[PDB]
């Protein structure tokens, strides 16, 4: 339903994150991953960036 128009550039520490989900819809222009922080606000992140892919790995484990 929702699209990421602007990304968080810097890496947030894994501890500050909570949950994660991807976005691959045709409606949205750029590919994106949406992390949910402890304080229950969602954050847009670029998957073309190792720090995001590593954050996804940690959440899986």
């Amino acid at each position: 339903v929702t699209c990421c128009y602007n990304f968080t550039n810097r890496k947030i520490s894994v501890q500050r994150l909570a949950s994660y989900r991807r976005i691959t819809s045709s409606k949205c222009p750029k590919e994106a991953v949406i992390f949910k922080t402890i304080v229950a606000k969602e954050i847009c992140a670029d998957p073309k960036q190792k720090w995001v892919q590593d954050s996804m790995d940690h959440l899986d484990k």
Binding site: V1, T2, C3, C4, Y5, N6, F7, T8, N9, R10, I12, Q15, R16, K27, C28, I34, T37, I38, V39, K41, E42, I43, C44, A45
Partner: protein, 216 residues
Amino acid sequence: SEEKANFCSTHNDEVYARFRLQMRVGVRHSPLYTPSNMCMLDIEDSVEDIEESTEKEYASTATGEAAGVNVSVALVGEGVSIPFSYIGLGFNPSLEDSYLYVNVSSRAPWVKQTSDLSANGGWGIKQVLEKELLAIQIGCDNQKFPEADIDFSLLVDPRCVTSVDLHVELRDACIDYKQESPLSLKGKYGDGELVKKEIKDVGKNHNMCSLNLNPG
């Protein structure tokens, strides 16, 4: 300003943060949107404990709903509280495609003292420069459709949002009385200067609603 000048002169070695957002959202409605003057405004502060960290996580969240659109602005810091004191909306209630305007501001130090981010060798400033997050989100209510840089996330539902233009700043409250400051962040999406100008003259042709929190 009378309160301001006295403060900035009497507090010249300190640094108080001041967040300001001016945002314009291009609005479109579902065919079943019924025009409404309704406005909903809220400001919520929360505190969460981090696992390996000694520093609490502080969030201030301003929300507004009007014209079928619901907006969320969250400013999050690690060890640093920057609370919102003001949200204002400018909106057209009709079906026609229109612009929604949003102001969001943090408490001015002279009204009620925020923390001196210059204390302990500028510890507070380092936290903001390194950790502060801004998450702006924009959705479509319960409309049914047919089936230096501030680090900011912008997340929108495109079914009701045709455009976003915003300017956002996090700066030394008293930067007008200083040649330089370690605290001066800024952010843009689209034409930020344009929205910063437009938003000061929308009361002529828009519903205006605002929420200002108790000072003191």
